[PDB]
RNA sequence: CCCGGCGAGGGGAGUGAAAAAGAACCUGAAACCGUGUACGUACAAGCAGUGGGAGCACGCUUAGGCGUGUGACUGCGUACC
RNA sequence: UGUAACGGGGCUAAACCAUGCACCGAAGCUGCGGCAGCGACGCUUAUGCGUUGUUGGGUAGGGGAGCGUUCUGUAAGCCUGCGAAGGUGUGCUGUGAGGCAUGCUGGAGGUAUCAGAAGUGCGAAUGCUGACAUAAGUAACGAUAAAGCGGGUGAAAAGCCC
């Protein structure tokens, strides 16, 4: 029965994949808005 | 032929000449810029 | 696990290009233009599922207006007449009777003039 | 990637797009963007979750009649023919024999049989109790299992 | 079912003769445009020429109100540059009055291949007689 | 002899023995329905409605086939704003056949 | 009976050959040979050799009787290009596409 | 000096509508030799208007 | 064996299960280029579609008046990022 | 630049003012059919319905739910030379990403279900690589020292040899 075991309900959440398409919700800008220092790779200010 | 074509596309990649566009193309861009000032 | 993406990309492109048969030039050959053509055809098709209701209604009104003026009353007075005569025939059917059955349309005009007077 | 850090063309004036390295990940022959490294895939399983899981699977092997308890299970000579005949007599093809004292002759007799696996009571794992159709425990192995799983 | 569509192979269409003496230009023109579309027929269909053939005659005797006899100006441009060429209403009635009725009706008819085909059915004459006695045009009193 | 009757949402001009495609009725496949709300009966003498639906008229129609119509694609693209949404739709229909029209 | 001859890899671009092929398409064969004898093209030499080869394959490998044959199909496909280099001014080069073609003459009596 | 939209293959064939070659249109038959030649030209055997010329 | 310049290339023959497996060789996509057939197109203006839609050509079809291709004419309609 | 300050024809009312009754008019509201979210509510209790109310334009962005790809386990199982993957058509199907069946090509592999991991989905980056178009059978064929004829060889001669 190793093909009948199954995880709990709610334990494995999907994982945001950014940059794929328009339907996914997080495409083009991946959830990081328009230009600026925060929309840049490595970008962000210090603590 | 393929080797000569890759090298002879690679001819004006590191140029300097400023009156010639892209190293080689003749123009009037000196007078255009100079008249814009 | 490297995933090559040839076979599925081919399937998407082909799906779009089958939806663009009959278009002129690149619109039916090149993917990058057939994608835009297929979408713009989608937007038009939406828009025109609404306009066909508007266009058919104005066609029917023009035919009832023609046949009713052939029977000596305008469209405006004819619809007022039939509403006061409490006739609920919609105007697809009044246009269709007005083409196919001239005598029934004559009788409808008589109900309209009868109630309108 | 085995190349040079020479910039392939001048920054401005060629009509080419700007490029800086021949080892860019956008370039053919260029270097994976997020290239992988050798990594460890081990998960921590808490000890009480491992033992809990074994208690659940043993309870379901008992409940689904996939658990056979024999008093003794040993083969005469180290021959795969004898173990094949012995498992044939007991109506078992796919089987996990588990014995509290690992017999040498049994171990050599099950080494060629594909479906059959002989373990000591110490080294059982979840994936084999679930994998094999029937589990045949020696009574001594049952006692050792209860000592392991408390 | 589907709404009826007139079929241009099977459209029957009649011939009418209209005397344009002392009629107002726009009001006659609008009636002719209605009859040439085919808007007066119950089998009207917007992509089919269903209208009738109208023979307008006495086109030089058409009337306009106010000072439009002298102030109404017909401009056209010739394509050459300073080619703006005007002609008042009485100059047009003197030169070619057919152009007066035909300009009016043409501007009232839908632009496009169909409305060109609709204008081919209008036959205007400046006189009282027409060649079309073979088609037996009945007198449309409008 | 035809008859106009009101049906699901809209109206139909139908002779006898003619198959009509209506909206989805909640009727079994071989079962017969009656439309008691006929608006016109014309044979060579018209009969229509002062007050609506004709007093003595009814249409008996046998249901022929429930079904689900042609797929239509619904496309919602907002140019230049990063929004598109496609969807599809197959409308349920009911083909009936007019058994008879009673004036 | 259809009988084929081909010149694969013919050094002449397919456009230049298609002018001549468009001349003799549909003709009877002796008339087609009389057209290609007096057409002053390089492509007419190539097309004539393929047509003569197709008449010979017809009369030898198949049934005879040249006088009944007609040029039913003729078409010029494009072959592979030979990619060469023309040295232009100021140090720049071009690719010259030395173009080939594939002449096909299908001759038949029916 | 250079195009601004790539021309189609439609417009390309329309331009080539006139590039067609005209056939010969009929070539004449010699009086004596009975063989074919362009009109007003000598034959391959070197006759013209039924008399022998060149003879190489 | 035949055409061909004792060519190139081809057509047969033969091997092969298969030579549109022939060395330019497994599969053989797309762009791009052709040949053939059906329809449209030489008085008509524009993101080239879409809604309507005649006619024609092929298949049906117990004529059931459908399907496929084309698409005159007509409403609306200024690509994507 | 051309009427060119009613959209146009054209209008002496088809203008303006006052009153009135019609009709047209949108993706508004209603009718009919369908789907989905959030409440409430009697059961069904691990949820579906006789219900029932109401909501469903959407950028940045947040939340939820899925499809496909390659790889691992299930799988020494199950499909497969009575023909796999792939390629190319057709038909059916789901709200969608998609799925399923089958003709032809192909000629040897494919993989359910339920889990697991990702080099997991491209139309754009003057993106990288290959192929192929376009202008186009167009400019050009590289000193304006210059060729003409006879003969030979050859399948063919302006260019080779004499």
**Beta-carbon count within 10 A of D99 CB:** 23
Interatomic CA–C1' length for residue E134 and nucleotide J127, angstroms: 76
Residue G70 counted as an annotated binding residue: no
Q: Does domain D1-149 have CATH number 3.40.1370.10?
A: yes
Mark out the alpha helices in A1-47 (DSSP H runs).
Answer: none
Apex CA D21: angle with CA D15 and CA D27, to 5°?
Answer: 80
**Cβ–Cβ gap F13/C93 under 8 Å:** yes
Q: Domain-by-domain residue ranges, chain H?
A: 1-55
CA nearest A21 in F: which residue?
F82
Structure tokens at G13: 């671009």
Q: Where are the beta strands (DSSP E) in chain G?
A: 3-10, 70-78, 82-87, 93-98, 101-108
Cβ pairs bridging B and G (under 8 Å): 23
Residues forming beta bridges with residue G10, ordered by sequence position: G101
Q: Does domain G1-110 have CATH number 3.90.470.10?
A: yes
**Cβ–Cβ gap G91/B1 under 8 Å:** no
CB pairs under 8 A, 24+ apart, for C13-17?
none
**Using a CB-CB distance cutoff of 8 angstroms, which residues of chain F are in contact with residue A23?**
84-85
Q: In degrees rounded to 5, what are phi and psi of residue E53?
A: -90, 120
The residue written with tokens 């023109």 in the block is: E29
Best interface-test mutation with E: which of C66, C69, C94 has the largest number of E CBs within 10 A? C66
- How many angstroms separate the CA atoms of F103 and F16, rounded? 12
Whether there are 3 or more C-beta pairs closer than 8 Å between G and H is yes
**Using a CB-CB distance cutoff of 8 angstroms, which residues of chain H are in contact with residue G19?**
19-21
What three-state secondary structure class fits G84?
strand
What three-state secondary structure class fits C112?
helix
| Cβ atoms of G58 and G68 closer than 8 Å | no
Quick one: angle between helices C31-70 and C91-100, nearest 10? 70
Residues forming beta bridges with residue E122, ordered by sequence position: E54
The strands making up D95-99's β-sheet, listed across from edge to edge, are D67-70, D134-138, D95-99, D116-120
Nearest to G38 among H19, H20, H27 (CB): H27
**Cβ–Cβ gap B11/G95 under 8 Å:** no
| Cβ atoms of E113 and E36 closer than 8 Å | no
Closest CA to D124 of D94, D91, D105, D146: D146
Strands D67-70, D134-138: parallel, antiparallel or unpaired by DSSP?
Answer: parallel
Nearest to F77 among C39, C49, C101 (CB): C39
Strands F72-78, F2-6: parallel, antiparallel or unpaired by DSSP?
Answer: unpaired
Query: Which 8-state DSSP code applies to residue A28?
Result: S
What positions of strand J are covered by protein, i.e. any atom < 7 Å from a CB? 1-4, 8-14, 22-27, 31-34, 58-66, 68-71, 73-76, 86-90, 93-99, 112-123, 125-137, 142, 151
Measure CA H43 to chain center: 15
Whether there are 3 or more C-beta pairs closer than 8 Å between F and A is yes
DSSP codes joined into one string, G53-74:
HHHHHHHHHS---GGG-EEEEE
Cβ neighbours for C64, distance < 8 A, ≥ 6 positions apart: C75, C78, C79, C91, C94, C95, C98
Apex CA G25: angle with CA G19 and CA G31, to 5°?
Answer: 105
Closest CA to E36 of E11, E58, E65: E11
CA torsion D91-D93-D98-D102 (nearest 10°) is 100
Check CB contact of A28 with chain F, cutoff 8 Å. yes
Closest CA to E69 of E28, E32, E100: E100
| Cβ atoms of D108 and D84 closer than 8 Å | no
Report A:1-20 residues touching D (Cβ under 8 A). 1-2, 5
Cβ neighbours for H10, distance < 8 A, ≥ 6 positions apart: C25
SS3 per residue for chain D: CCCCCCCCCCCCCCCCCCCCCCCCCCCCCCCCCCCCCCCCCCCCCCHHHHHHHHHHHHHHHHHCCCEEEECCCCCCCCCHHHHHHHHHHCCCCCEEEEECCCCHHHHHHCCCCCCEEEEECCCCCHHHHHHCCEEEEEHHHHHHHHHHCC
Quick one: angle between helices G14-24 and G43-61, nearest 10? 50
- Experimentally, the structure was elucidated by cryo-EM
Helix (H) or strand (E) holding F6: strand F2-6
Structure tokens at G30: 């002796």
The strands making up F92-102's β-sheet, listed across from edge to edge, are F19-23, F92-102, F58-68, F32-35
Strands E84-88, E73-77: parallel, antiparallel or unpaired by DSSP?
Answer: antiparallel
**Cβ–Cβ gap D127/A5 under 8 Å:** no
| Cβ atoms of D7 and D20 closer than 8 Å | yes
DSSP codes joined into one string, F43-84:
SSSEEE-SSSS-TT-EEEEEEEEEEE---EEEEEEETTTTEE
> What distance in Å separates residue D12's CA from the closest CA in chain A?
24
What three-state secondary structure class fits E17?
strand
**Cβ–Cβ gap F75/C103 under 8 Å:** no
Strands G3-10, G101-108: parallel, antiparallel or unpaired by DSSP?
Answer: antiparallel
**Cβ–Cβ gap H24/G38 under 8 Å:** yes
């Amino acid at each position: 029965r190793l093909n009948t075991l199954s995880p709990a309900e709610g334990s494995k959440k999907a994982g945001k994949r950014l940059g794929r398409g328009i339907g996914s919700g997080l495409g083009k800008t991946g959830g990081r808005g328009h230009k600026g220092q925060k929309s840049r790779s490595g970008g962000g200010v210090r603590r | 032929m393929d080797i000569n074509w890759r090298h002879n596309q690679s001819t004006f990649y590191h140029f300097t000449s400023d009156h010639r566009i892209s190293g080689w193309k003749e123009t009037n861009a000196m007078y255009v810029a100079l008249n814009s000032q | 696990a490297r995933v090559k993406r040839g076979v599925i990309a081919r399937a998407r492109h082909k799906k779009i290009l089958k939806q663009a048969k009959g278009y002129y030039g690149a619109r039916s050959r090149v993917y990058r233009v057939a994608f835009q053509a297929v979408i713009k055809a989608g937007q038009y098709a939406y828009r025109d599922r609404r306009q066909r209701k508007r266009q058919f209604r104005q066609l029917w009104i023009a035919r009832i207006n023609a046949a009713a003026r052939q029977n000596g009353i305008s469209y405006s007075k004819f619809i007022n007449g039939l509403k006061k005569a409490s006739v609920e025939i919609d105007r697809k059917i009044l246009a269709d009777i007005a083409v196919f059955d001239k005598v029934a349309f004559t009788a409808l005009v008589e109900k309209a003039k009868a109630a309108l007077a | 990637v085995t190349g040079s850090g020479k910039k392939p063309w001048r920054q401005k004036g060629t009509g080419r797009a700007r490029s800086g390295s021949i080892k860019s990940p956008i370039w053919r022959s260029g270097g994976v963007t997020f290239a992988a490294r050798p990594q460890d895939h081990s998960q921590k399983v808490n000890k009480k979750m491992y033992r809990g899981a074994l208690k659940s699977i043993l309870s379901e092997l008992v409940r689904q009649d996939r658990l056979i308890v024999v008093e003794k299970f040993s083969v005469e000579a180290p021959k795969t023919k004898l173990l094949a005949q012995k498992l044939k007599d007991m109506a078992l093809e796919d089987v996990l024999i588990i014995t509290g004292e690992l017999d040498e002759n049994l171990f050599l007799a099950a080494r060629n049989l594909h479906k059959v696996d002989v373990r000591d009571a110490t080294g059982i794992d979840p994936v084999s109790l679930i994998a094999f159709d029937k589990v045949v425990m020696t009574a001594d192995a049952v006692k050792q299992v209860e000592e392991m799983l408390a | 079912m589907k709404t009826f569509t007139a079929k241009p192979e099977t459209v029957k269409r009649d011939w009418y003769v209209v005397d344009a003496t002392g009629k107002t230009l726009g009001r006659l023109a609008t009636e002719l445009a209605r009859r040439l579309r085919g808007k007066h027929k119950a089998e009207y269909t917007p992509h089919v020429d269903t209208g009738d053939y109208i023979i307008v005659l006495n086109a030089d005797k058409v009337a306009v109100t106010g000072n439009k006899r002298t102030d109404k100006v017909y401009y056209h441009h010739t394509g050459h540059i300073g080619g703006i060429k005007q002609a008042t209403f009485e100059e047009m009635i003197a030169r070619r009055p057919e152009r007066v009725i035909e300009i009016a009706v043409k501007g009232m008819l839908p632009k496009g291949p169909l409305g060109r085909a609709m204008f081919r059915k209008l036959k205007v004459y400046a006189g009282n007689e027409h060649n079309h006695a073979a088609q037996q045009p009945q007198v449309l009193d409008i | 002899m035809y008859a106009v009757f009101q049906s699901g949402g809209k109206q139909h001009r139908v002779s006898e023995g003619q198959t009509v495609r209506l909206e989805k009725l909640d009727i079994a496949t071989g079962e017969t329905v009656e439309f008691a709300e006929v608006l016109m009966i014309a044979n060579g003498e018209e009969v229509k409605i002062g007050v609506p639906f004709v007093d003595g008229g009814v249409i008996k129609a046998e249901v022929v086939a429930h079904g689900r119509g042609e797929k239509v694609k619904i496309v919602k693209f907002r140019r230049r704003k990063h929004y598109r949404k496609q969807q599809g739709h197959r409308q349920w229909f009911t083909d009936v056949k007019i058994t008879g029209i009673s004036a | 009976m259809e009988t084929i001859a081909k010149h694969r890899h013919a050094r002449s671009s397919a456009q230049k050959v298609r002018l001549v092929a468009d001349l003799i398409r549909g003709k009877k064969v002796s008339q087609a040979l009389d057209i290609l004898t007096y057409t002053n093209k390089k492509a007419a030499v190539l097309v004539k050799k393929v047509l003569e080869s197709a008449i010979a394959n017809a009369e030898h490998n198949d049934g005879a009787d040249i006088d009944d044959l007609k040029v039913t199909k003729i078409f010029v496909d494009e072959g592979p290009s030979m990619k060469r280099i023309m040295p232009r001014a100021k140090g720049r080069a071009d690719r010259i596409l030395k173009r080939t073609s594939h002449i096909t003459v299908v001759v038949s009596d029916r | 000096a250079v195009q601004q939209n790539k021309p189609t293959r439609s417009k390309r064939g329309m331009r080539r509508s006139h590039d067609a070659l005209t056939a010969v249109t009929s070539l004449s038959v010699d009086k004596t030799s009975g063989e074919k030649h362009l009109r007003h030209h000598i034959t391959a055997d070197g006759y013209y208007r039924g008399r022998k010329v060149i003879a190489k």
